[PDB]
Amino acid sequence: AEIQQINIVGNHAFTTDELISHFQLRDEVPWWNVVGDRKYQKQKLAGDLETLRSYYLDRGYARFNIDSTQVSLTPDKKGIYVTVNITEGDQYKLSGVEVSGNLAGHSAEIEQLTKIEPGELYNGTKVTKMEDDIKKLLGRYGYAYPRVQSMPEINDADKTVKLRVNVDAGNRFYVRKIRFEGNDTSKDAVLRREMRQMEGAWLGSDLVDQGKERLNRLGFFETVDTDTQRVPGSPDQVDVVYKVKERNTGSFNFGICYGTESGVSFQAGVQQDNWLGTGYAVGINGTKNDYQTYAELSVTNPYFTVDGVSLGGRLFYNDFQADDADLSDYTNKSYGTDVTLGFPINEYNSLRAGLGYVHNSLSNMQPQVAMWRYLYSMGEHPSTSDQDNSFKTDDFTFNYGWTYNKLDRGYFPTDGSRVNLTGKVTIPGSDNEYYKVTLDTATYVPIDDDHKWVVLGRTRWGYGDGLGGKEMPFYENFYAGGSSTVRGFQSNTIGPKAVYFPHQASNYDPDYDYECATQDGAKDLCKSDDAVGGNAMAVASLEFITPTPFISDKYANSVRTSFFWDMGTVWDTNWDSSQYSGYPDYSDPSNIRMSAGIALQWMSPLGPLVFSYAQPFKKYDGDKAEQFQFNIGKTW
Amino acid sequence: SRYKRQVSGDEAYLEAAPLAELHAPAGMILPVTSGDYAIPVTNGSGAVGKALDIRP
Amino acid sequence: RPDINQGNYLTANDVSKIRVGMTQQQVAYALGTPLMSDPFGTNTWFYVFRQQPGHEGVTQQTLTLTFNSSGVLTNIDNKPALS
Amino acid sequence: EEDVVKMSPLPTVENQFTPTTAWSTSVGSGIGNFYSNLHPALADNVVYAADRAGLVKALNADDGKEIWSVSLAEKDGWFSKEPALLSGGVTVSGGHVYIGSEKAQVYALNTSDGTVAWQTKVAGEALSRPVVSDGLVLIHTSNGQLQALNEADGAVKWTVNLDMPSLSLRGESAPTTAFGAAVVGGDNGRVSAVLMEQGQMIWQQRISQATGSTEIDRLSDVDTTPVVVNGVVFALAYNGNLTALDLRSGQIMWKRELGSVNDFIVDGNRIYLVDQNDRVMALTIDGGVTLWTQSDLLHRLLTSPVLYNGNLVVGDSEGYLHWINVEDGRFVAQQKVDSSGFQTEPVAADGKLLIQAKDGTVYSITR
């Protein structure tokens, strides 16, 4: 049964339609595809009243009372009539506040707060924030639970109001033990590192709940709820007890196949996010295919020091015979190790730095300028052939980054932002010398208090270049094309094209596509639609997020739909642009690539599944323009 | 799990630590016990370890 | 670096109401229960007020109140020195 | 209506007499499917009728037209002008057409000059039909109050509090003149008889014997007007309880149980009422035995069983008027004068039969 009329009767100088907008339940749908709770719910109807109550208190009425709420029902049972019978008073202005009761000689901070300037209209929520301000000064002194009761004094003689606050502060409560219980597989240090209440300190009710929110944010526990229990003895001692119930942390996924033409696919990931119960997250994963082999072991240990300085790293293998489309086909055999340290200086500012080692052994490289510059600088031989483009290198780097995170909802933010900065600069003990910096930023700003209209700015920019006489390595290049970057284009099709020096394929197979190659049949220089990436990048996007296309109440916060405009360019700041008749130059910034479209991102049980349909307005500099983009696990 | 045949759960009560009271100088009185944690004496007897039959 | 708040919370004026002649029953009402004592020998209640903000160093005020075995007098030994 | 049985076997009868469709005057904008107590009332063969949009459009009896178009919107501009949700019902008496609204205003227009009017604020929104007798315009309210308004000007009033659960059913029991007593249904299903004199004789007799949680007096309330025949009133609760109370005492009550929301009319020695599951019955007046029964028109919202030209007129939610015979409980004819249904009551008065549609079209039907 659907709401028919929400009659507010006994208004004085105010409309009905306005009140209707701040209720959970609404009587009509005045817009398109925006149907929330039309199913009548007793709990929501009760909530509509409490908001209505606060609303008139905020306008200046301290004589606002709801006489009775008549829920009649039509005899057909296909309608609900709601009529709220109300009464109101006159405007009243807060003149002063008297705070009376035990302040304990904290009167010069308590009565310095809760002070309202003369001749300002009564606000009901002004009282509640001030009541909580009083409780915060108090809980720092160790009076964790004060009793702050506030009722007004009504004067109709001068149509004014004066407020009384009855601040009764207790005795101090000292925490005796912080006992952790229901820790079936977890050690104690896991729940104890994530506290802001310390055992044997003064209690703060806010400090305990502050610690409660950190236990929810490890995501290794299903349900966390505090219990504040008074020890036999004085009520001046307490044991703060968390009953946690363990999650299914830890998963062994093995997938093994045989395919067509004697193919084999091996995929395995062992992840334990509560490894050995120490609450360190450790796993090992890898896939073996004849197409590509990649294996990584990752050893992350959060909160390793007193400050919370983390320790982490990986041991890894990146090995393949070719790089598919939109990229150049080469044999890589590569492995490395990283170790990261993570340094928290603020709750929202994380700094990181570490030491990265990667060995790359590269062979079978087709002639291409990003490569030509790299092997030129080492003094190895540039060759027409690909066996004479075979080299191995040690590449050793300092890594740094910085993170701002203040994402509000997290899984589907409407407010908040993040700033991701990731960059590296070489340390001696390398054979390469280069620098990079890159960062990506997203800011979500809600343009209404429903959070159904959300303006999302998004941008990513990068620059690196060679250092000293050494060049930019051609496997540390920046790329663009895809969901995160400029959609509507092929993945990694944006940037410097392979201008093809005539390639002499030593192992020329029947019709082995090498584009402009001597073996292929060509003898001239020409560019392709496979982009080797530049050492620079730009992406900027404006997304405006529309409300859900569903009239089902189910999908409202688990699905989002957006209309977007993407723009971007990828360019190499050193380049041979003298290499083709009609070659666009990338040495100085190239023509912008621009795409616009519609997208639907659906939270799915396979991780976030992201579909978009977009058109680049034209093929700019021979970049592959796609009618539809799909990608997997692409986060908000 | 990979437990024993005679009892479920890895047994280490055979490799259990010896318990021996603390001493202190005169002037330091070790704090008196709280609650029930003292190991009672046995006057009886019985088979020990996995030589014990735990059949009902 | 988390905020490390430790020890009993001692107001400056309410540690200036501890006077020899006070019983241990009275000291426990005015300051709260001490949460920290000497396990060896006779009871010495130590009311440490220990704060480390994680940006600043130590502020330690040790108020050592010895009630001996009689439990009738309080030997006032106040050290408001950081460690 | 039921939401387990929908689309009941549609009645089939061939026309013994072909009725007359007439002026489809779209009074106001319409009541939609928004349930309301509304009906035409005519005097001097000039029909006065209105709809939920605050639009009172006067009609003739033979030819519609003759429209004094009044837009009532007084005391509705708190912040913005809003249409008065006219939902009391049209009743013409003293040349003063009383129409309630859900804006807690009981408007009174003038037959000669619709322009000159007055409105008195009633406590809680108006929902019952304004039955005016003893010079007092009695309106029961959805809040469960009884307000009397002076025939002219609306100065004198008296405030009678009646019980209400505040979580009841809807429709509303209007005051009925019975020897100068205002016999009026409860919103708790406690049938009261208030003498029309400064709110005296305030006593209730509970007719509801319904039991069950959310059924005790949340689904068993009087939504009928109680009919005086022979000095015995009969009020119907939704869940059963055809309680018949002598006007002499009222405490003396005797039961047979049959249900209804839409107000029933006792004409002759037959109690015409639409039953619980919309089954048109005539029953004995002092007996409880069923004289005849129509179960075939089983589920579509039926309107007030009025008596026109010896026929019994009810109307469904598809817009078929049904003429059921009063001697054997079988249909005579059935005809749609309108595509849309009827949720508003018909009125056999002046020897004319008027009924008002959901589009807001008021037909006069000659039989």
């Binding site: 310390m198 | 479920s8 890895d10 630590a17 021996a20 709280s34 009672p40 | 396990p39 | -």
Partner: protein, 213 residues
């Protein structure tokens, strides 16, 4: 018949495994929850659950036994078995466990197992399970002392020096004889030294000097 499933229940318990005695004992129960055979079949069903590594149904069948029948002639078995089922919960025996056994997980089931073996030893010291329960109490007190030892060890690296001394004070009070208490003794000295009064560190230091480890 009920006699014939009981006959093959003994043969499938004795000659068989404890992971196939369950299909016969639940069959006897399908006829009668409680009822005629009461909880006698549910008694051998305690022993069947325990060996089949289904410890939460095993504890639940003890609790069925002790309520429907208050006192038993195998009440020696009851107080023993419940501590054994709790103690195999402490150990790595079911799903989820990581072969840990490092005494820093749950203070609930080990406190419960200690309670249940302690009532066995005091309750019937003329039992055959008394000496074995006594050795398991010793192991479990080592675990309980290693529990507050782990808290206090973490509290030297959260730098909460009041939390350290209230935990080691708790260990002198609850476990005055454990080897893990002795390990925690230098830790109590260090937390007292960080405090202004270094006088109290020196007292604790003298306990370390006196024998100890």
């Amino acid at each position: 018949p009920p006699n014939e499933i009981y006959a093959t229940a003994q043969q499938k318990l004795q000659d068989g495994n404890w992971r196939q005695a369950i299909t016969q004992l639940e069959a006897l129960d399908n006829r009668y929850p409680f009822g005629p055979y009461s909880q006698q079949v549910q008694l051998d069903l305690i022993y069947a659950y325990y060996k089949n590594a289904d410890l939460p149904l095993a504890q639940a069948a003890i609790d069925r036994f002790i309520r429907l029948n208050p006192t038993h002639p195998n009440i020696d078995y009851v107080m023993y078995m419940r501590g054994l089922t709790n103690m195999a919960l402490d150990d790595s025996a079911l799903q989820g466990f990581f072969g840990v056994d490092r005494s820093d997980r749950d203070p609930q089931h080990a406190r419960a197992a200690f309670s249940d073996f302690s009532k066995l030893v005091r309750g019937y010291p003329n039992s055959q399970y008394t000496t074995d329960a006594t050795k398991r109490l010793v192991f479990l007190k080592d675990r309980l002392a290693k529990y507050e030892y782990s808290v206090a060890e973490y509290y030297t690296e959260r730098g909460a020096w009041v939390a350290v001394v209230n935990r080691v004070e708790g260990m002198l009070r609850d476990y005055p004889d454990t080897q893990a208490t002795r390990d925690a003794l230098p830790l109590m000295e260090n937390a007292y030294r960080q405090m202004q009064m270094n006088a109290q560190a020196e007292k604790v230091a003298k306990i370390i000097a006196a024998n100890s480890s």
